[PDB]
Design a binder for this molecule. Structure first.
Ligand SMILES: O=C(c1cc(=O)[nH]c(=O)[nH]1)N1CCC(c2ccc(Cl)c(Cl)c2)CC1
Ligand SMILES: O=C(c1cc(=O)[nH]c(=O)[nH]1)N1CCC(c2ccc(Cl)c(Cl)c2)CC1
Lengths: 306, 306
C-alpha cells in the first residue's frame, strides 16, 4: 500500500538525450535513429527573440553551425530541416540506444513523466499533468529547453512533450514532437498569458478511490447524486464537468472498492461545499487532480514494463 | 522556476535489477559485478515466516535452489552466503552494466529515490525521506521486496536502502545494503510497530526558502527569534529541535534570498501557532518536510549528473 507521485523509469529516455549548440545558444535535443529533434528557437539570438522570422534565420545557417554532442562523442550534422516549431538535424550516426517509440499528442487531464535535462545531461524525473489550459506546472531552470515528456506502454516510449518556454506566471509551455504547440502559444519572447485553469474532476475522483483503497474513508456518505446535479455544483467551483465517458473510465475503481461513481460524486459535492475541516486525504489537505484513473490502477494494483 | 517532487534519473539502476526465485517465492535482486543482493527472507516458506531460523534454512539450500533471471538470460548461481539480513548470491557472469557505486547508510531526515520493481522489472520511481522513526512512507505492492533506494552523486550511485516489508500502519521498513535494518525491526512476520514520528524541521525551513525563491512570500514577517525560543515551540508541535549545524546547512539558501535563518524560524513559529488560514505554499496546504536543503539547492539553482 501507500500512494506517491510516481514517474516512469527514465532509462530508455536518458540514452536519447544530447546537447545541441548553435552559436552561443545551447540546449537539449532528442536523438532517435539518425535524427536529433530540438526546439527551433536554438537558432535565435538576442536580436531575434522578440519577432523571429525562422525561415530567414534557418536559410542563413549551414550544417556546420550546429554542434551536437552525445556525452563526449561529437555527432556530425549532415542535414537540417524545420517541421513546425521543431528543428530536425540529420546526423551521420544512428543512435544504437534508440528504443521502440512513437510520437503521440496527449489531451488535457492526461499525465506524463518529464526528464529534466541540462547540457544534454539528465538531472531529474517527475510526473505532471497537462492542464486544461494547455500548460504544465513543471520545474525548469535556464538551459532546460528540449527536455521531453513521455509515457511508457509495455516496451514502447510514447513521447508527448518537448519543453520550449516558461510563461510569466511560472508555468510551462511546449509542443508535441511534431512541433505543434499545446495551447495558443508561439515561440517568441512576447508576453503571453495562459487561459484560466480548471480542476480535472475525473482525476479528483480517481484520487478519492485511491484514498479508499488505502484506508482513508472519512469523507464517504450514503447519499447519491445524478450527473446533472453534480455538474451544477462542479461548475460553481471551477471544476471540469463530468461525462458518461468519465464514469465508464472509473469503472474498475468502482468495481474494486464497491462504491458507485455517483456515490463518490456525492462525497466530492460535500467536500467542495464544506471543505475538509483540517482533515487530510492521502497526506494532502487539498483535492489532488494530477492522477488519472489509469495512474491509480497502475499504482494500486501493479503493472510493470519491458 | 517551479518546484516538484523530483527523483533521480533511474537508468543506471534499472540495468542492475534482476528477478530471484527460491521455491515458490520470487522477488527482486540487485546485480552488481558478480554478486546478486536480495532480502534473505526469499528462503522462507509459509511455515517459517513467523519465527524463521535463517541459519537452519540456508544450510538446507544449495546453489541450484536459486533461480536468477536478468530479463531472459539465466544467471548461474555458483555460491551463496548471508550477510546480516541480505543474501549474497555469487553468479558466473559479472554485470556489464555495473555503474560506479557505493553502499552508504543514510540518517533520518535524508531523502533518496526509490525504484519500485516487480519480477525484476522496474515499474516506477519516486522520492521519499527516511523518517525520524526509521520508516519510509513508500508505495509498494506484493512482489516489491528487494527494490532499492539510491542517490546519485556525479557519476556514482549511492545505494542506501533495500525494501523488506510493510508494517501494519502501511509504512515500510528495510535495510542498508550491508543488511542492517533501519530502526528496531526484524525480518519476521510478527506484528511490529514503529515509534512515534516527528516532523523534520530543517527540511520544513528549506521548503519555505524554496517558496520564497518561487515567489510565495505571504508568510514572512520582520520578527526574529533565538534557537532556544524556537525549539521550545517546536517541541510542543512534535517538531525535531533545530541545531546550529542545521542553521549552517541552510546558509546558501539564506544567502540567496537575503532572509536570515532565525528570521525564517520566526515565520515558522507563526505558522505553527495560527495555521495557514486556507492559504497555500508551493501548492500545498500543509508544511512539507521531505525536501532537504540540498534537494532545494539542486532544484532551485541546478546541478546535473554524469
Ligand atoms: O532555458 C530557458 C528557461 C526555460 C524555463 O522553463 N525556465 C527558465 O527559467 N528558463 N530559457 C528561457 C526561454 C528562452 C527562449 C529564447 C527564445 C525564444 Cl523564441 C523562446 Cl520562446 C524562449 C530560452 C532559455
Ligand atoms: O511483497 C510483499 C509486500 C511488500 C510491501 O511493502 N507491501 C505489500 O503489500 N507486500 N510481501 C509482504 C512481506 C512478505 C514477507 C515474507 C517473509 C518475511 Cl520474514 C517478511 Cl519480513 C516479509 C513478502 C511479500
Amino acid at each position: 500500500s501507500g500512494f506517491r507521485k510516481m514517474a516512469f523509469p527514465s532509462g530508455k529516455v536518458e540514452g536519447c538525450m544530447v546537447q545541441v549548440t548553435c552559436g552561443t545558444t545551447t540546449l537539449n535535443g532528442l536523438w532517435l535513429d539518425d535524427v536529433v529533434y530540438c526546439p527551433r528557437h536554438v537558432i535565435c539570438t538576442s536580436e531575434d527573440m522578440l519577432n523571429p522570422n525562422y525561415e530567414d534565420l534557418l536559410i542563413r545557417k549551414s550544417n556546420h553551425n550546429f554542434l551536437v554532442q552525445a556525452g563526449n562523442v561529437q555527432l556530425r550534422v549532415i542535414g537540417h530541416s524545420m517541421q513546425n516549431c521543431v528543428l530536425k538535424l540529420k546526423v551521420d550516426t544512428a543512435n544504437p540506444k534508440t528504443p521502440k517509440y512513437k510520437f503521440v499528442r496527449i489531451q488535457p487531464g492526461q499525465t506524463f513523466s518529464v526528464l529534466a535535462c541540462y547540457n544534454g545531461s539528465p538531472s531529474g524525473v517527475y510526473q505532471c499533468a497537462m492542464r486544461p489550459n494547455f500548460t504544465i506546472k513543471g520545474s525548469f531552470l535556464n538551459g532546460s529547453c528540449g527536455s521531453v515528456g513521455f509515457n511508457i506502454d509495455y516496451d514502447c516510449v510514447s513521447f508527448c512533450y518537448m519543453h520550449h518556454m516558461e510563461l510569466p506566471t511560472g508555468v510551462h509551455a511546449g509542443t508535441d514532437l511534431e512541433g505543434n504547440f499545446y495551447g495558443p502559444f508561439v515561440d517568441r519572447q512576447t508576453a503571453q498569458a495562459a487561459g484560466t485553469d480548471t480542476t480535472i474532476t475525473v482525476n479528483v475522483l480517481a484520487w478519492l478511490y485511491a484514498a479508499v483503497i488505502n484506508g482513508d474513508r472519512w469523507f464517504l456518505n450514503r447519499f447519491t447524486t445524478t450527473l446533472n446535479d453534480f455538474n451544477l455544483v462542479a461548475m460553481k467551483y471551477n471544476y471540469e464537468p463530468l461525462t458518461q465517458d468519465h464514469v465508464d473510465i472509473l469503472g474498475p475503481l468502482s468495481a474494486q472498492t464497491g462504491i458507485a461513481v455517483l456515490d463518490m460524486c456525492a462525497s466530492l459535492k460535500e467536500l467542495l461545499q464544506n471543505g475538509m475541516n483540517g482533515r487530510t486525504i492521502l497526506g494532502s489537505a487539498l483535492l489532488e487532480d494530477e492522477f488519472t484513473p489509469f495512474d491509480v490502477v497502475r499504482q494500486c494494483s501493479g503493472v510493470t514494463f519491458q
